[model samples]
Each structure stands twice: as structure tokens, then as C-alpha cells.
Target chain A: MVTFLGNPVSFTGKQLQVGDKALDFSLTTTDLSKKSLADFDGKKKVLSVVPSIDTGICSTQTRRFNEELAGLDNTVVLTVSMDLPFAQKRWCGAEGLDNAIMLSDYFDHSFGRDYALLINEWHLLARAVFVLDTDNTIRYVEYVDNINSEPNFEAAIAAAKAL
Target chain B: MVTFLGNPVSFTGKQLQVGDKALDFSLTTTDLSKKSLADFDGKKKVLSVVPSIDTGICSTQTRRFNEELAGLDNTVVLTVSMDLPFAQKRWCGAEGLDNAIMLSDYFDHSFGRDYALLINEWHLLARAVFVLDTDNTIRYVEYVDNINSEPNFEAAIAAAKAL
Candidate 1:
């Protein structure tokens, strides 16, 4: 559940809940390569979904999480958005976020739809965060109610660390 | 016709050529507003299509045209890419591309397929250039055969100035 400009809007895919089995996704990388969840198998994952990296809140969210990931060792952090792979690389470089993995669902919204984070009206992914354990079971899920705001960083990080 | 990594590739929709009636497009601006070919009805247009704006060649192409736009007062320069509008907006601001209008075909590949520039396998727009007269009739067109190369800027500029 998300709202754009204070108006409640629906998402396209089924809303994923906590303790659900995470779905594998094919997403584009900064190098224009196709990567799947299997690529990071056996590691805990923090899937950060943003509408676009160029926006203020989204940029801040990515940067803050990238910095936070340094303390949480062994956790794979990915910031997924509709930005093209090329643009994602550029933004990451500009922000000095070398530790974060930026992926694009631009060609196909596989990640957005699979995670049920796709914003129906905007054609973008809703602001959300998902924490998965090594077994790929979704341990923590936060679908931010407001699209303009950032996801709950402390809660997601705590959950990942606990996992 | 285009090629990715030296292999032959093709695009969807009818390929654009000189003297053809330019098809109208629905594209997104930096402000996330919908713009059409009819928006610039009275002015000549230089429609520059690229796979992504953050790439070296595409960025260079857009900047050069933005510089060239200074001399052609009557001509409107638009760079179209599959990048999200937010990324396009950010890249333009970073590169100081104030003169060129950056439009995105990300929401849908409307501009890409309508101009027959959407790469089949790559899922990106083919590198192409089209100069349209005030009447929206194509005056010059260039479809770069090698995806790695740049279009003929001098020829496109000359055609736009001639109009």
C-alpha cells in the first residue's frame, strides 16, 4: 500500500508479506548485464526499492543505506529502480557509493512486479524495503505508505542484522 | 538496421527516412510532463535518439547538440532515450545541457518503436538522428549501423539550419 501526493494508489503485483518465500528476479546491472537472485545466493539480502535514483528522497535513502551496509557485514544490499543501468552507474559514482549494488528493472519490471512494489499509476516501483535471510525467506518487509518519503531504514537494518 | 557487438540486429516498427511524414510521439519531460510532436508544431525539430544518456557517446552527442542549439535559434533540439525522466533531468543538469530538451521513452517505448529505433535484443533505442521541417516532414535521417558509433552531427545540423 502506497500513496502518491497523498492520494492512495494501488500496486500491480500481489503485495508480499513477511515470512513469504522471496521470488527470484532478473534485473539489469550497471554494466548492462543480467543478474538474478541466484547470483547472490547464500547471502542475506536487503532489497531497497526506489522509484528513481535522481530524486532527493531516493538518493538520500540509497546513500544512507550504502553507508549503513558497511557495518552489517555479509549482507548484500541492492537498490533497485527504473533508471537505466548506465544512469545507475553514473549516479552511484557521483554519490561515491561504491559498496552499494545498483540494479535496473528498466528493460523489464521483473523485480518490481515479483516483489509487488510496482506503483500502478506512476509506472515506477514504490518506496519499500525487504530483508531476506540466507534461505531467501523474506524476514522483514516495509512497503512505505507514502511514495514521497523514504523507507524505514532503522527497522529494516535491525531486522537484517537480527537475521 | 543496427548491430550490437558486431552482430546484425533489427528494430520494431517502420524505419524512418527522409521525406517521410514524421509520426507524433508521447514522451516524458524532466518535470514528468507529457509532451508531443505537436507541442513544437511551429518550429523545426532535431530528434536525436540514443540508447541511454549516461553513456559516453550519447552524453557527448547530447552536449554537442546542446552547444549547436545556440546558433540555430529557430530549431528545437530534443534528445530521446529510454532513461527515466529523472535520470535524464539529472544528467542534463550535471552535464550543463541547458539548451537541449531531454525526453524519456521509459514509461513506454513509444518514441523508440514509433521511429523504428528500438533495438530488438538490447531493449534500447537505436542510435539515430532525424531532422524535421516545420511541417513535421523528415528532412534528414541517420541510423548508425554500428551501435558503438556516433551519428553524423554536421549533416544533421546542416539539415536543421537549412530548414
Candidate 2:
């Protein structure tokens, strides 16, 4: 049986560590422009990956990060998902969430598959959080065991800040 | 406010009809192949548009259609939504549903906008059912007013059978 939430999980993709260089990932910006991990180099990044935006937990995470991380310095908060660019833009706009950048991995499920979070391709994303330092090294990682559960944001943020 | 479920509904996008002839729509298939509505032109169609396949009603509706409509003459059931085709295919496969063809309207929200089903840009393809004869003339239409409600399947199937 393949690994999924509430099911036994087997790691499928490359895993990164605090000193390991973050792999370059291509994502679609809200304006329908292509963006890569390199674009946010030299800034700390909080990557929040969720299965869908319409769900309660995802919406909570996006809004919480957007609110809590608003004034932080040199920090780039990104909410990444397989949702379309238009849906991401509309969601952010409607919710008045402007702090975090909405990045869409819709062109391909690259981020999910490459990061080992692609939960069988039927789901949009596995609920996961990754915080990286300015040097593009992974500072923290949290893969939610349940697809419907929320990630440990405080722990991830603390890890990133310590870096 | 537009008419829906015998009530007025204020939604984004223009309204469409059966004989209106759909503009080309590109969606991801289960194999991740891009597909268009025109590809199924020769078959009688029952376009079942739901909010998400993860929910109970949506899954039940898909299964019901798959069972009741199997082996019908030149009839094809197309389930349309914003869900990735991979997810759609997984659900169908798990349920042993092979009669219905699932299509993802993930590209531009064109299907929702053209059908006037988008409630704000946050939601796509309202809980609705559109039955079309082999010639693509809309024979029955039902757009549920309450987003949480299931569509009228009996009337929809009856209309489809009449065609």
C-alpha cells in the first residue's frame, strides 16, 4: 500500500537537512509568472504546502502565517499548493491576506513529488511545512501525519529564527 | 442575482445553455493528458459538476451515476470539477467506477465562469447538473442554490433518458 495520511508512510523523495542546500523549485506566481527558489535567495523562507485552499485547516494556516509574519524582516512567507494561479490570487485577495506570497505548483506537481509530499497524485498536496535560512539551507521540516491535520507552525518558525 | 434552485444567486461569470455550444475547455485527464469537451461530442452527456470529490455526497453521486448509467447506448458521463484528474481517477478506481469519465477544469476556471457557477473566485463549478442530448442540446439543467446541497439526480437522469 502507498503511503498516505492515516496510512503507513514511506519516504519517497530526497530529504534535506539544516546544512543541506535547498533544491531549486519552479512555481507559478499570482501574476502567472514563473518563479524559482533562487528568486527568494538571501531571504528566509517559510514554505507552507497544503492539499487545498478551500479546506478549513489550509485557510487557517495561510491566514495565520500571513498575519503573524507580516512585519518580520527579510522573511519570505510562501503558501505553496497545486491550486491554479487564479484561485490562489482570488483566495488571497478575498481574505485580505497580503503578507505571504501565493505560489502555485500547478504547472506540474514538481514541488509535491520532488519534496516527497505528493500523496498519490490524487490529493493536491501533503500537509507539510519547511523553513529555510537565507543561505537556502533547510532549517526546519514538519510533515503532518494526517492529511486533515495542521502543521506545527510555531516549532517550524522557531527553528527558522534560530538559524 | 441569477436564478438558482428557484432562488436568486449572485455569482460571477456568464450563464450558458445546452445548445450554446461550449467554448473549448482544456482539463487534465487521469493520465495527466489534456482533454477538451469536444472530445466527447459524439456521446450523450451528463455533466456532473461538484465542489470536491472528497466529500460524501459528491462521491455518492458519482457512484450512483456510474452504476445506473452503465451500458447505456452511446451515453457518456463526464464528471467535471477543479479536482486534479489524478485524484478523480483514484476515487473512481477505488470505487470500481469505469462508466464515467472525469475531467478537471483546473486551468483557468473557464467552466465555472462560462456556466455562471463560480461563487466569487474562491469556488468553481457550483453543485449543478447539466444533461445534454447526443447533439449537445441541453435537455435538463439544475443549479443547486445551496452550495452544500446535492443536485436533483432523479430529474436530471430522467431528462437525460428522455433524450
Candidate 3:
């Protein structure tokens, strides 16, 4: 379940909670390439999940991670969305955000469904963050209680750093 | 079924043929709003089904329609794709294509599946075109036998014009 504005919405799949092993999920990149969890093997990861990069909060979330996580050690910063690849590439180019890898989950919703982040109400990934250690254990998880709000960037970055 | 470089690809939904009732489908606009077949009720329509807008043939197909279909009487030209609304909007903006409606079939694959335009293998819409009369009867239907090539653009528009 996802807490969206004080209401719990349904998420239909087995969820990987904190301390759980990150399951494999294929995602599409802005270039229409397939990527799964194994791509960044042995590397810490900070996955910023947002609804759409075109919106204010999502753009802010993605831009901030790319901004603050520049010097983080061995951590690959990723911004995941259900928006199409063209939009992601165009948005990154427009914002000059080259530091973070932008991945699109629109085609199959593979990442959203497998991660238990896809919400049924709006068909968007809950504004969530998942920090994975080098061993594939999820260290920190945050599902922003409200759809309109920002994710806790500091906590996520700190979790990735501790990895 | 469609052939991609002479290899057969399947589409699972009920296929539409000429003289069939144009099925209803809901699509997303750039603003994340729902649009159904009734939105263009009582007006002739030219529905250009595209796989993705970022690719070369898709771009060429959309641009040619936006260029050639102008000044057609009583016809609402629409280009549908699996690309998210944001990307569709951005692409239309960049190309100065304001004449036709850009609809996204990404979220639910509503238009793609219902129209039998969804390609099962690639999880994308097949390259197709449909022209419907004011009463919702499909007057012309063309599914590109080879997904690599373009549809018969002039023929589809002519059918809509005849409506």
C-alpha cells in the first residue's frame, strides 16, 4: 500500500522493503535500451522515483539528486519515471542534468510493479526513494506520504553514502 | 500480425477492419487528462498510430501529416503513440506542429490494444493508420505490413476527406 495524501492506495505485487534484497526489474533508458538491477553490480545506488519529470516536484527531485549527489562515493544516482524516454532526454538536456542516469519505466512498468511503487489511483510511482547497498540490500526506503510533496533527499543520500 | 524485416510479429487484441465500428479508447493528453473517442464525436478523424515518437519513421509520419493534412474539412487529425504526453507535447512544440492532436497511449495502452495496433514483441504500437467517418464507421484501415516502413499517408487522408 502507498500513503497518498492520508489515503492508502493499493500496490499489487510483492514489495521489497528495507533490508530486503533488491529484486531484478528491467527498465528502459532514454535511448530505449534495457537495464536491470544487475547492470550496476557491486555499486551503491540511489533511485529517485517520481511520477513525471515534466511536473514541478519531479523535476525538482531529479535535479536536486543530480546536484547534491555529484561527489557521492561509488553510488550511481538514478531518476526513474513512467514518462517516455524522449521526455526524459529532453528534460535532462533542457535542465543541463547530465550527472544522473534517467530511466523510463513507462513501457512495461517493470520497475514500478516489481518495486511495489506503482500506485493504482494515478498510475504513477509513489514519490519514493530506494537506497541499495553494494550487496543488493535495500538500506533505506521512503514513500513520500503525499503525492504533491518532495522526497527526503538528505536521508536517501546519507543511506547511499553509508553503503 | 506484422513483419519486421520479414519476421512475423503478433498483435493480440481484436483487429479492426475497414467498415468495422471504430472502437472507443481513452488516451492521455499532454496535460495528463483523459480523452476518449467521443471527444471527437460527429467529426471525421484520421488516427495515425505510431510506435514511438522518438524514432525516425514515427517522426517522419507525424510531420508529414501535420504538413499535408492541413485545410482538410471537418476532419480532426490525431497522431497516437506510446510516448508519454510530456514527450509528445515537447516534440510537437519543437516541431511547431499545432494543427493535429497528439495523444499518448502510454499509461494504459488503451488506444493501442483496442485498435489492435499494439505489437506484442516490442510492446509498442504497430505502424498503422485509420480513417473514420463522422458516424464512427472506419472507412479506411492500413496496417503497415513491414513495421520498418511508413503507412500510405495520402490514402488515409483521402479517405478522411471523402468522409
* CAPRI category for model 2: incorrect
Residue range B23-50, candidate 1, lDDT tens digits: 9989989887899998998888888988
Q: What order do candidates take by DockQ, descending?
A: 1, 3, 2
lDDT of 2 by residue, B7-27 (tens): 455776566665665445677
Clashing pairs in 2: A122-B87, B18-B138
Q: List model 3 lDDT by residue over B1-163, tens digit each.
A: 4786468999886789988998888888876678888899878888888877877899999988777777777777788988877778777877888545889887788777777677776678888888887888888999998888988987876776667
> Candidate 2, TM-score vs. the true structure?
0.56
Kept native contacts, as fractions per model, are: 0.92, 0.00, 0.50
> Candidate 1 chain B: worst 10 consecutive residues by lDDT?
B91-100
Task: List the candidate numbers ranked by TM-score, top first.
Answer: 1, 3, 2
Q: What is the lDDT of residue A154 in candidate 1?
A: 93
Q: After superposition, how far is residue B43 of candidate 2 from its true place, in Å?
A: 8.3
* TM-score top scorer: 1
Give the candidate number with the greatest lDDT. Answer: 1
lDDT (tens digit, per residue) of candidate 1 on A21-48: 8888889888778888899988989989
lDDT, candidates in the order shown: 0.84, 0.72, 0.81
